[PDB]
Amino acid sequence: PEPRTRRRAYLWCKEFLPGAWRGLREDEFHISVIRGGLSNMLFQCSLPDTTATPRKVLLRLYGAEAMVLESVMFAILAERSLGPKLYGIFPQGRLEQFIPSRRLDTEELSLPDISAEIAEKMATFHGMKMPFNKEPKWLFGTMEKYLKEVLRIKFTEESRIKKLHKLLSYNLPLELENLRSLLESTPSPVVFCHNDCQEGNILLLEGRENSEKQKLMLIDFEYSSYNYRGFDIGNHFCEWMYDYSYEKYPFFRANIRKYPTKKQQLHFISSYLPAFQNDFENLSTEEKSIIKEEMLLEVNRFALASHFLWGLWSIVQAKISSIEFGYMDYAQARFDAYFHQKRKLGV
Ligand SMILES: Cc1csc(NC(=O)[C@H]2CC[C@@H](n3cnc4c(N)nc(Cl)nc43)CC2)n1
């Protein structure tokens, strides 16, 4: 961090944080990076070990309408103990509780205890009443948004042109309508969705590793909105196939075989349903199975919208992102998986 901003950070923490931060000099202010990106940047600010009395906070610099919303949403989830505590909010960013933890790894998503908890937390999130638009316009609204951007994009480099040409050759505008007809035919309750429920957005809390049902916290609610519940679950299933930790180009690995098996999907929803609908436990065996089977159809259909949306999203990112990542390859992997899924489903 360039030392000019190492100043601002100091002030933000001097002004906004209580106790020993109030009477802190600039010569005792440690702040390391946590993640660059020139957008939604994260830093760890802390005291010297020498200063008696929180000792560590996270600072989030925004970088690049939706600012009002994100802020209220974060504040609400903090108030309700569903998110990190909010300690300071300003134009450039916010100071948040630092949660001692690590992000999950992809392989961990399939661990029965982890899956069960993720299902529980998503269910809780889905139960939240939030002060936002309750109409489910997000999913197609966003896909149309990205689609229009996609059709406008021109790349100078030659292989990017060929990659894009291959993607445009699927006839994306017609394929979107194909998905619309399928998804408008597939009922799914509208709820407050995380919309980006990937391993990277799930913290395993330090010293709770032994807890069976209470070791996780969903974070990063950048894409959260009222949306079809099938999207949140289908999208999460899809994330079983993608590992963003790979250290070589394109900086992800995709594995269609790691998509949850029927059994793994039933285990997830088995834990989702009681958590979401409290009386669910008390239905007949017959009735539970009906709901489960319907739910498998629903989530596996919406899974198609996860490939499609993130596919489009990734083409745009290839134009405009500063992040070192193989977007065009990722987009192609999402479309591969999209068609593979349509084939598996007979749609
Ligand atoms: C150099 C360095 C020191 S620590 C670090 N990375 C990490 O600790 C991981 C795991 C914890 C995670 N984290 C903890 N609190 C939060 C929070 N409030 N919001 C978000 Cl979005 N993430 C949070 C950050 C990413 N890098």
Ligand SMILES: [Mg+2]
């Ligand atoms: Mg993943």
